[PDB]
């Protein structure tokens, strides 16, 4: 289920090195995908201690956007841009070959990709070569719709939530609204922006409302049923805006800066009656020493659906290689006109909460054990250093000890299952005191570790080089150290390891 998650009501920061430029989220709220030039990183948002699944695709050009498929019947699909082609990833497939099919459309780099909310098998791609192509995932070979602006490179493409064949694209200073049955001729051309428009977003509730954001600091709200020229509202900021989007709950919108603006995501209420105003946000998500490059939302709700009681968590990804989860308080839920608890006109969709970070797997061949697997993990011990649940964690303790002792080799680190298996060379030989014996110690932690009365369980693998009396003495001293350090409700894994080898 989604309600036993440990990261939804809490704030959490993860350090994901590698230079990732794009991010997208599962609508179930379980997985988050990060795209780079080397491929995809899938992180479990309920088990952030596990290192993310790397799916390999090496490209020299920087990736633009990644997008999860919101189809409930296809929850294994990820569309990611690989320069001029979009790659659909099958997470049920193995990591060596996880690519299902590739959309070979535009000639220049794909700029943005979006899914149709009404029909989640329809995808629209925009690119630098001044083309917006609409694809069908049932027949992913040629686009069923092509349109162009013919002058300026596209920046985003977005679908209309209400009318399921209207999509808009932003090409420099101009926003063009396309009808899918009207060819390349636009329904309207919003031309009120001075500088280049970065982000575009439709309204989920109104048929004909679009918000825009540009480099001049202006956030413009449009209603193309009334007038193509001019705007219903114009909000001016002191910073350029990179991504501006409407809120998924209540009446409001969320914009974030491009190069300045204290690198904080801004949340602004939208509840009022041309109005050149300034930005008056409610909440600013302070943090993020370098600029934020995308923001997402994490939604969970009841499975059956009688009242609209859903909680939201903001997920932001920044240039300083930090992935942060932001809790949203009920003060924000009330300041935005959001009716928490309401009889549903239509029940909310239900998504499977299955993770995808784990590696999947399925003349004749004889059954054989050719080479030993044990003869065949510093990435894990460096990944666990970047996990911060905002020594206060088991994984932070494990990473600190792994950084403290480079000689100690970890064979199995599992913070989620609280099981540790580490190998070392210890001076515990009865024949010669100078001889070092290879030892395998498996450590099991309780769910109440490190509270008082809940010590870790130490099991040492049966070694021929280790005598039974010395093994029992080592185990008894390890139990003594664990009981003595859990009596003060401190952490006992560094005194134990420093006892086994050395003092």
């Amino acid at each position: 289920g989604p309600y036993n998650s440990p990261t939804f009501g809490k704030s959490l920061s993860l350090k994901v090195d590698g230079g990732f430029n794009a991010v997208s989220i599962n609508p179930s709220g379980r997985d988050i995908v990060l795209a780079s030039r080397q491929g995809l990183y899938i992180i479990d948002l309920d088990d952030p201690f596990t290192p993310p699944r790397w799916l390999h695709h090496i490209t020299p050009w920087q990736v633009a956007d990644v997008q999860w498929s919101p189809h409930p019947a296809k929850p294994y699909w990820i569309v990611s841009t690989s320069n001029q082609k979009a790659i659909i990833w099958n997470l049920a497939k193995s990591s060596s070959n996880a690519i299902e099919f590739v959309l070979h459309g535009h000639s220049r780099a794909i700029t943005d990709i979006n899914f149709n909310p009404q029909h989640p098998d329809v995808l629209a791609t925009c690119s630098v070569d001044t083309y917006v192509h609409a694809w069908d995932m049932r027949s992913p070979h040629r686009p069923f719709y092509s349109t162009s602006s013919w002058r300026s490179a596209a920046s985003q493409v977005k679908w209309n939530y209400k009318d399921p064949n209207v999509l808009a694209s932003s090409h420099g200073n101009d926003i063009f609204v396309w009808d899918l049955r009207k060819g390349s001729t636009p329904l309207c051309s919003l031309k009120g922006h001075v500088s280049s428009v970065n982000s575009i977003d439709f309204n989920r509730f109104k048929y004909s409302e679009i918000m825009s954001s540009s480099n001049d600091g202006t956030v413009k709200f449009w209603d193309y049923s009334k007038s193509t020229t001019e705007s219903k509202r114009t909000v001016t900021t002191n910073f350029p805006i990179w991504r501006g989007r409407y809120l998924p709950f209540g009446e409001g919108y969320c914009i974030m800066p491009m190069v300045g603006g204290n690198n904080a995501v801004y949340l602004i209420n939208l509840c009022d009656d041309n109005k050149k105003t300034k930005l008056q946000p409610i909440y600013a998500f302070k943090g993020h020493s370098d600029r934020v490059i995308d923001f997402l939302w994490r939604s969970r709700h009841t499975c059956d659906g009688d009242y609209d009681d859903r909680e939201f968590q903001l997920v932001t990804w920044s240039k300083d290689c930090d992935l942060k989860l932001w809790p949203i308080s009920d003060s924000i839920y009330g300041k935005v006109n959001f009716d928490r608890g309401k009889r549903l006109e239509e029940k909310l969709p239900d998504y499977d909460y299955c993770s995808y970070n784990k590696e999947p797997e399925n003349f004749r061949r004889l059954r054989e054990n050719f080479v030993t697997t044990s003869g065949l993990k510093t990435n894990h011990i460096t990944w666990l250093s970047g996990i911060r649940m905002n020594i206060q964690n088991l994984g932070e303790e494990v990473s600190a000890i792994g950084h403290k002792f480079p000689k100690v080799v970890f064979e199995k680190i599992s913070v989620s299952t609280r099981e540790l298996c580490l190998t070392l060379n210890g001076p515990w030989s009865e024949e010669n005191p100078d001889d070092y014996i290879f030892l395998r110690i498996s450590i099991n932690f309780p769910l109440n570790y490190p509270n008082k009365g809940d010590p870790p369980k130490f099991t040492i693998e049966e070694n021929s080089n280790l005598t039974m009396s010395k093994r029992q003495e080592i185990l008894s001293n390890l139990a003594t150290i664990g009981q003595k350090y859990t009596d003060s409700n401190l952490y006992c894994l560094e005194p134990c390891i420093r006892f086994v080898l050395g003092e």
């Binding site: 690519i99 092509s146 013919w150 060819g183 390349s184």
Partner: protein, 242 residues
Amino acid sequence: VDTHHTITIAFAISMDLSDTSFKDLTPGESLKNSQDYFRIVVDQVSIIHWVDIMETLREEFMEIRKDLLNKQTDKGYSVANGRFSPVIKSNFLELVNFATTILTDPFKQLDLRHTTTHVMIISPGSGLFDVDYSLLRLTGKKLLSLEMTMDLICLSKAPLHIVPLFRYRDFENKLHHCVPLWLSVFFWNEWTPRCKIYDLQMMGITENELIREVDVEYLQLNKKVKSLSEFMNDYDKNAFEV
């Protein structure tokens, strides 16, 4: 050099009207279904107006994609359709005959300030053109009867073959190669890549889908060999044949 010319710049477009991929095109055969366009950008204009000439050229080149690839449907809207032909399958002899239209009559109006009629063809290819045989014969017979020098200039690197190269299919579907005498090829500019592989330079093929399918063979026999040593001897004897 303080030359006083009259430039005349015209675009030259061949549009492919079929949905067949360009990889399926046979070398030597031209496109069966095509439409040919001609956008005259700058007319007979003196070269002291080179600022206006360049301005018009840049504006019309930026507008040619909207002009051609946005066809008008009778239902009241426009559909983004159409494709430019490749250089090899382009309408090169049609372009040259379009050029030689203006010299058919010796007794035309006299340009009393200018003397020579020189035609330059700017192409993004490398001197390789698939042409029709009868049109090639007619183009040669026409170019040998008038005072023009078609100076083809290629914006790609010089290839590994002799330029200009024309490939045509005869009446018996026989491939031929010929170098025309009347066309002179210039190139506008340590190892330099002189062979064009577009799908590997642009990385247009995803790494999981161009993995090698056909491998080394399975060492077929001879039906004359009864010993393994005889097989090794017959393989070593024929290891360098052909």
